Amino acid sequence: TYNFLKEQGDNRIVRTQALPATRGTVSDRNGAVLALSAPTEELKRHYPMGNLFAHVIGFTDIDGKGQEGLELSLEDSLYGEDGAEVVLRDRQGNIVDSLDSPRNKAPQNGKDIILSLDQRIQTLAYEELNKAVEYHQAKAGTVVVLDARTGEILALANTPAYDPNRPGRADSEQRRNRAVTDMIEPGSAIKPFVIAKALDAGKTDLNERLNTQPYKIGPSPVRDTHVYPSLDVRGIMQKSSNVGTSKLSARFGAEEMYDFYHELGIGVRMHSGFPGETAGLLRNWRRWRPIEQATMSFGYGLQLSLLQLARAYTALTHDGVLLPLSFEKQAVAPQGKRIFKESTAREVRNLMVSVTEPGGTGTAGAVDGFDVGAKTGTARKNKHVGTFIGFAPAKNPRVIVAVTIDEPTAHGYYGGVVAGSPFKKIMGGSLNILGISPTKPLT
């Protein structure tokens, strides 16, 4: 009797055998392989580049289902469809016959994805980030680099990280994708937008001189670090004047300001495609006092993730049009949402260059051969969080770099010193990597 016609016994056992799909591969924008599957001694996931892209890509569970990062969120297109076949086997595991069955199915492999991220920029961001964190004895740190013209993410790293090839020994603090999951107070980093809105609506202009003496809203004082009797809009930007900023904001009602912050993306989920997105914090305007509106104008009382912060800056770099962010490689810039006039964005960019020049509050982030528009700040959580964010070449921007250092312990606290050195190295490096020439003679 032919073996397939027989009753089963100890040595002929009907068995449905899985034919596993192979999971899609993840590559960087130039083709470098970041994630792939190999047959195991079932498939196994390999991350050839180790902890470099840990938080972005995330990892997979023992059954090859996405568990964190883009492995989780792209799980549907990445997994494929396992196949199967019915076989007779012997008690030693040898396939003895292949049986006809409507259950015999070929596997469908997963879709490959090409990220927008650039291994060279990721490496530079990764290196400079850890140098800063280790030097300042900080708790943690985050970097985001964007294409100022397309919204494509070029790099995104956080420290501490973990090896995604060995995710089972990774701490909760290690696994957290801070750029995406963590709310911060922007502090001075919001001021450019307040100024731009005032300019865009015509509530101020480039000639107006504001009285910027410290004042009080009821009992609560509003003051700068130094007394400046009067500043124009350029000086308000340059000196990072709380007084000037809150006065310009106070020329708008609470609802108008709220709708503005909201349309920049504050208080809602980005829906970027990453899992674990924070919604941030924007309190309903109906609950606002004048003091709260004013403190928001200099970046307290409202919160967003560093990735939200960096995205807001696309309104400034992409000629007043706010872009959605991309983790996948784009052929062209996506349609955005117009927020400012092109005319307004150009002048505000011009103003921000003054922050990084001798008279400004963030000279630590100046880059040889380039005009850099930037803001810098430090918010309390004592324990602090230093931020530095900016773009270059300021007239025709190409890159946005955002950096936060969390609880620096040694060699300062201020974000300009602390988050300013890595910002400068990462920005300079990135401009070099992208082959952008200097616009002014090098020192």
Swiss-Prot record:
Note: This protein was sequenced in penicillin-sensitive strains LM306, and FA19, and in penicillin-resistant strains CDC84-060384, CDC84-060418 and CDC77-124615. The sequence shown is that of strain LM306.
Function: Catalyzes cross-linking of the peptidoglycan cell wall at the division septum.
GO CC terms of this entry: plasma membrane
Pfam families tied to this protein: PBP_dimer, Transpeptidase
Description of its domains: The enzyme has an N-terminal penicillin insensitive transglycosylase domain (formation of linear glycan strands) and a C-terminal penicillin-sensitive transpeptidase domain (cross-linking of the peptide subunits).
Protein name: Probable peptidoglycan D,D-transpeptidase PenA
InterPro entries, A to Z: Bact_Transpept/Beta-Lactamase, Beta-lactam/transpept-like, FtsI_transpept, PBP_dimer, PBP_dimer_sf, PCN-bd_Tpept
A GO biological process held by the record: regulation of cell shape
Listed pathway(s): Cell wall biogenesis; peptidoglycan biosynthesis
Keywords of the record: Antibiotic resistance, Carboxypeptidase, Cell cycle, Cell division, Cell inner membrane, Cell membrane, Cell shape, Cell wall biogenesis/degradation, Hydrolase, Membrane, Peptidoglycan synthesis, Protease, Septation, Transmembrane, Transmembrane helix
An example molecular function term from Gene Ontology annotations: serine-type D-Ala-D-Ala carboxypeptidase activity
Bilayer topology annotation: Single-pass membrane protein
Enzymatic class: hydrolase
EC number: 3.4.16.4
Cell wall biogenesis/degradation listed as a keyword: yes
Keyword Cell wall biogenesis/degradation set for record: yes
Active site: 188
PANTHER family: PEPTIDOGLYCAN D,D-TRANSPEPTIDASE (PTHR30627), PEPTIDOGLYCAN D,D-TRANSPEPTIDASE FTSI (PTHR30627:SF1)
Gene name as annotated: penA
Similarity-based family: Belongs to the transpeptidase family. FtsI subfamily.
